[PDB]
């Protein structure tokens, strides 16, 4: 592969702009795919609440369901507050 | 109303300075001063005949670009979805054929003005 | 569709933005999304025959709900009925009609 | 072509909580924590009786429970409160982050008077459960019978009697 | 930096939208009783402004079910001044 | 909603009638199409606002997207008859009856 | 519209009598096919000028009018003489007649001769189909 | 074209009406509509003679004006009912202009001066290409709603069609124009039946569909674009004057070919539904188009005309044409009338 | 207020009667603008504001290139205005009489058919979700890329082909 490192220099000094080009829009896909924070983004969206939260009617067959906003129960913040 | 009625002040300032331009000036008009310029010569012909586009396969090719910045232009709200990695793929997707289509036309010598 | 391709792979790619009553971003219910929903619901598996008589009730407010036919046209005559009364000097608007309510809240 | 049925003016009269948004934020968070009860009634009366008329009843209780809650702030916390909402009230879209010490100064008087804990963040926007004795409306749309499907044909499948019987082909 | 700030202003933006999730109980308690008050008044001048109409049957629904349908705009604001209907039209989006 | 339908709806018929009745130009009736374009772009933007139908939005976009590749193979067009004939009048397009 | 009632007023009475108002109303609908055919034909074979266009259109108009004329008047006539309401033979009576005036028209005894065959037997058929019940346009059954 | 192009263009030609066929979405069968639009445009003007650039053009002109209104009559449905797809409440008036929209895309008469200019001014490959595989889109968008379909303009097109297409076969010595032609009267029997029944229209559309192409692939063997042309095939290629003579008859749907089927079982069904005067107008002039068939089979195997010196030096060659698709075509299209009952249902 | 948008739909419909008239295609793209920016504020009249911003500056982009293709291949020594030919400034003057002319007649038959003058501005804005904070056009639009992806796809393609298809038109 020293034919294309040759290539590759060439490429460098004289269309540099192309080279620069070609490396970003690799590296674009590349880093959400190695990144350890890709998966909080989702997460984060998923954690503004642009709409109204519509209680449930409590039929006593809800143990996971909080009965008051600072009930233990529910969706925890925690990771984005020490994010 | 507030941005209606600036505008319209900024069309009433320019009105009225082109009234002013045409009304305050003393006058002298006699055909060889209103004759179109060339440099101290007549023209030949009308500036109305044919002009040659050498870029007119940019200029249509523009045209596409155009519409392909519409669909990048929701990009700021699309990232707020929860499906980010679809968001993304759509994204990454609709910049790489694009530069695929540049890519094309820039070795077809599509970007070359026309001789 | 002439050929069902997505209804056999059991995909979507235009079946679920039909209408109004669709999903919508954010949770945001169209206009008529209850009415739509009841007229949909009424002719679900009886065909187009049979829908067009037997779920009549239902496209007729559907119907109402999105042009807004009989709306216009009740309000256009209390609103004429007024202009009528108060050129013969027989109605006086309220104070709240006038533009001197006392706003809530 | 029924007759659409309005509650009186006299039944919509209410105790208004008649303060404005700049105040109505400053208190929001402590608001949501010691009047969620009531609140989280209405709004399941609302949504699953999708009719403002029906819920009427539940409406006055929030308008109550708010006058309940600004009369606890008004009598203990008056002036650490005053000093908040009207800081908060200064910005053009009344944001929290430009008056952290004064809400501070608040939040610890509300601990101390009225032992309240201001929630978390993400902890409002919960799904909650809330008990009542309201009914389950059943047929909340108001939807008709659902016209029969037709009658499907049972049994199985035998050949075409006479085959095609397309014109004079035998088969 | 602009993922730490970015970071925080997603934070901030769930303590502001979190504001408005404890105070909307009361604005829809408040915006059920003033789109109902006024639809009384309608109903009342409709039944002396329609009284020596023949056939009119005051407060009569346009629709064959019995669900409440919320009211247009159009309904609200009919009988009042031009200023209202307009405001109501164009308040939000001529406001700059 | 109800006056704001009809002039657009008349906006088009214009539009269609100024595309069916030929001049001289072809550019001319190149412009009649963006005409016909245009109108329905607003007719379908004001009815998916009117109903608060945010799912069909992405609809209006992609009308003009096709109507941009229908402009944009139009003019290529233009550019041959153009190239064959000088001008771009419909008049010299007639070989093709023999 | 009124106008498709204007036209169904031929068939309202039995033919043989009032023979004035089924002349004007053959009359309207020969004119009507006249200014249809007069349409195409000045849009796709344009003439060397507008006044010949115009001169054209009346042409043609004028003369699938007299062709409509001759045909309702001719039917009712032979149908009063005959005292046959229901005979298609009234009809190919007149369908020659107002075959008979197009070649007239046009000078042609070719038109004339060739014309009288193919519009009594038109017309007659067309009696035939209003007795019969058959249907020009029928919707789908099956 | 380099291969690249060919790809890209070909699949656009293909995608088009993959995506009208499977759509839901009324706004997705105009895009495909669309993509057919473009994609065939650069195909039609490969060549570049001021020919080829008119054919275009016309055609350009002509179909956009067409899908602008099939998108009004969408829009107009949108409107009216909020859905992307028409129903039975759909307004009459928005189902008109969609038919009158379709039938121009289509090239039925009275809209249909276009089609034999435009089939005139291009390769016959693409000649080809438009009257087969270019129909199928606007005619399946039709199948979808057939019941909401006016019967009287259809059978008004309809007669139309059969009338002018024979009438406009008659006087042709182009062989790209008495295909086009031929095209107007078979489209015209397609929609007569689809509202009735659509099944039949699909029939039509497949049988008129393998007789065209190997019609076309014959045409292409000598490159014959005029009767005098096609004459010499005794000389060139006599081996084919066998299948052209059975394929001519059959699209004038002379018994007992399989070209009879379509017009028979047609005019059956139409008269189940008691439509017996347009059938027997249609019938009776679709004699014409057997006249102007014959006429060209008296040309090219019945009688021998006269050819010329060069023609020997054809004789020394070898020929690598036809493909064997087209003696399957040549042989399904003439000799499959007694599997008639496995074809209409 | 009540008349804004009933005026502009009516500036909307003159632009369009004077595109049909076609004079030179100088002022033929001189009235798509026109037309174009009363456009933009019809939808943003209804509540909109990316949708009309878009087809503007889609427009804008739209016309500038015709404007170029114009001066090249579509000009003549005299180019034509509304004003030049007697018989376009006549249809003119009769299409906006006969424009006054249709709105008046219908309004006098229906009253609340296709023409409510006297409801004009009453039965432009029918529901708002008074407390909605996510409700912009662009959002709607976004869903391109998220739920209607199908959508960007057939989208994206067509003006992909479109490279290559212009391309092949336009080569000797
Ligand atoms: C600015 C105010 C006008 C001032 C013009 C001026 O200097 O005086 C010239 C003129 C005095 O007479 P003149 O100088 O001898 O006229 C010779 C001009 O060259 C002859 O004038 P011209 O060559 O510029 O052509 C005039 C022509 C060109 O003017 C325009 O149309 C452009 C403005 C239209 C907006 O205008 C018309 O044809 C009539 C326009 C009617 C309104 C258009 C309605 C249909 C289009 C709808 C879309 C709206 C756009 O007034
Ligand atoms: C009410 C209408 C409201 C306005 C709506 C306008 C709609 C958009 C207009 C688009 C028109 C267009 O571009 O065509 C260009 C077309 C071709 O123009 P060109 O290639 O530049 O030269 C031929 C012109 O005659 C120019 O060359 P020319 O000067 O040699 O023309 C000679 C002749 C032309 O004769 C005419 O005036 C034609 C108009 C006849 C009156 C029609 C009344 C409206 C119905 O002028 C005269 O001497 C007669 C003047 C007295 C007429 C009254 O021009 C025309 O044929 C007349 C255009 C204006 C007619 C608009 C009326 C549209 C209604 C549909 C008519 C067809 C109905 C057929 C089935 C029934
Ligand atoms: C109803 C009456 C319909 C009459 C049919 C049109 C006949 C008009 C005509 O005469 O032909 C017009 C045109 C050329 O005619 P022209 O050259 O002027 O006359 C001979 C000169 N020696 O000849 C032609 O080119 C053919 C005419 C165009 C096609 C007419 C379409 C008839 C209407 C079908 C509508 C179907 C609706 C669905
Ligand atoms: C299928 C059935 C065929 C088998 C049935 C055959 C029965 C026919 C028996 C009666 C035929 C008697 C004809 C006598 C001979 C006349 C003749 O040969 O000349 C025909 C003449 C020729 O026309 P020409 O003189 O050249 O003038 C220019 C016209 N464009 O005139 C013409 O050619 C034009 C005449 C046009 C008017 C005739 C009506 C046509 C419209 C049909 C209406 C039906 C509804
Ligand atoms: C699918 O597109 O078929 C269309 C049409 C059948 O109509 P339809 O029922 O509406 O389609 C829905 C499901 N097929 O399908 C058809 O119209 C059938 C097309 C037949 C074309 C005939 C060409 C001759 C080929 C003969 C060989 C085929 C096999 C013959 C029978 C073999 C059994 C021995
Ligand atoms: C021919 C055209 C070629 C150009 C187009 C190429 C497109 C291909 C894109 C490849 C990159 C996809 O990158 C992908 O990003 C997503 C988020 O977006 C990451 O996804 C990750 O984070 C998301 C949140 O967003 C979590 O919900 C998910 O569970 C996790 O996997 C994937 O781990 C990574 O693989
Ligand atoms: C010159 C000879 C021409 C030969 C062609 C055939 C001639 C016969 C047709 C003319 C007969 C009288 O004219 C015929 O009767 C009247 C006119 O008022 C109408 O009669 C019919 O109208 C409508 C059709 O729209 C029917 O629904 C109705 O039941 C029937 O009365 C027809 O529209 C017209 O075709
Ligand atoms: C019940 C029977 C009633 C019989 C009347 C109805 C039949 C009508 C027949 C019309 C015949 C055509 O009409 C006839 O056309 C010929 C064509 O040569 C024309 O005849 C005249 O002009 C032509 C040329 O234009 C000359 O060649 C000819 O020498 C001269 O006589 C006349 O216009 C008319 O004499
Ligand atoms: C040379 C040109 C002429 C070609 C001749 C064509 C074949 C011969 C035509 C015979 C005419 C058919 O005659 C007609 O048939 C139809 C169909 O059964 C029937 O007519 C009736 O049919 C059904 C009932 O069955 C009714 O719904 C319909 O409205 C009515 O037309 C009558 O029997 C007769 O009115
Ligand atoms: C037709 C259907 C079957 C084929 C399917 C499609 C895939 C085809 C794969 C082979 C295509 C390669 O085709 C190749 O395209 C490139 C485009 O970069 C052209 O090459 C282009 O760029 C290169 C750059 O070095 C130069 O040759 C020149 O600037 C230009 O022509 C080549 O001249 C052509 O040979
Ligand atoms: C329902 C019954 C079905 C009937 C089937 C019809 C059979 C086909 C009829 C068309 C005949 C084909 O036409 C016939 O073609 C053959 C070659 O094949 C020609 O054959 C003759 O001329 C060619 C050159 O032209 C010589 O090479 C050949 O050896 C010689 O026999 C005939 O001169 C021609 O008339
Ligand atoms: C190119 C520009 C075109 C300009 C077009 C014309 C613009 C002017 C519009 C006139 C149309 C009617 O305009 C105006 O409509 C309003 C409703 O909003 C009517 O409203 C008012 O009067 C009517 C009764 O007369 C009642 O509705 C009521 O008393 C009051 O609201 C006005 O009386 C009418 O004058
Ligand atoms: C021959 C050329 C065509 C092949 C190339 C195109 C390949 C397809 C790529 C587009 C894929 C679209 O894929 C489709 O995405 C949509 C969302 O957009 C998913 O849709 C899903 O989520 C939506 C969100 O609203 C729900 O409403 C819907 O009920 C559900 O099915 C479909 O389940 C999936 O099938």
Redesign the pocket.
Known sequence: AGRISAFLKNAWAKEPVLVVSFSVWGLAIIMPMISPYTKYASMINKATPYNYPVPVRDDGNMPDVPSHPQDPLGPSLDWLKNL | MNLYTVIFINILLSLTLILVAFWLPQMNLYSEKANPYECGFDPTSSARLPFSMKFFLVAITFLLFDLEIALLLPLPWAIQTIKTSTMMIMAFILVTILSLGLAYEWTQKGLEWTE | PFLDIQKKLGISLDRHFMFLSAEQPYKNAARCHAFEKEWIECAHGIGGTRAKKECKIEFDDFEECLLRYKTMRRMHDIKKQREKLMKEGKYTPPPHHSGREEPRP | PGIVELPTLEELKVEEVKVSSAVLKAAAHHYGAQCDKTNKEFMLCRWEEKDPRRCLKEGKLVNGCALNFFRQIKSHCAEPFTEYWTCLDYSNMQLFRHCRQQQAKFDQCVLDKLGWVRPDLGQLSKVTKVKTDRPLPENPYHSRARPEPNPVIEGDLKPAKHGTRFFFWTV | RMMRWNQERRRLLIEDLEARIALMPLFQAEKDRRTLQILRENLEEEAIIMKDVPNWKVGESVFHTTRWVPPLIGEMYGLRTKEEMSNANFGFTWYT | MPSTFFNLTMAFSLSLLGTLMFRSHLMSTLLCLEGMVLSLFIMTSVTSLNSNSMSSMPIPITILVFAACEAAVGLALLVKVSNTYGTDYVQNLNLLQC | AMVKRFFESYHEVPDGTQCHRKTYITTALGGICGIIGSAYSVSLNPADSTLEAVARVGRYTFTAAAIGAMFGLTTCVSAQVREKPDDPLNYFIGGCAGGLTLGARTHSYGTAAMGCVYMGTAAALFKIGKLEGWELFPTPKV | MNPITLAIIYFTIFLGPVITMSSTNLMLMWVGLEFSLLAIIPMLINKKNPRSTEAATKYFVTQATASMIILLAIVLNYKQLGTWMFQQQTNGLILNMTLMALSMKLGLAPFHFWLPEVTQGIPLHMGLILLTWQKIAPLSILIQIYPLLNSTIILMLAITSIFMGAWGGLNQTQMRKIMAYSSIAHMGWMLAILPYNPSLTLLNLMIYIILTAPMFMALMLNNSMTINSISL???KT?????????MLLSLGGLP??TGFLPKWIIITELMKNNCLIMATLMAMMALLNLFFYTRL?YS?????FPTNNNSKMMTHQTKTKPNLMFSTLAIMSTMTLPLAPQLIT | MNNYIFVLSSLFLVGCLGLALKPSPIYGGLGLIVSGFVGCLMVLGFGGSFLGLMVFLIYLGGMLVVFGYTTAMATEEYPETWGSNWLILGFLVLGVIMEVFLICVLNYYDEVGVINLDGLGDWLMYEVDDVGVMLEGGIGVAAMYSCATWMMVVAGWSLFAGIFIIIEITRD
């Open positions: 095939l005794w000389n006599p081996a084919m004057l066998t299948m052209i003579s059975l007992p070919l089979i090219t195997s019945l009688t021998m």
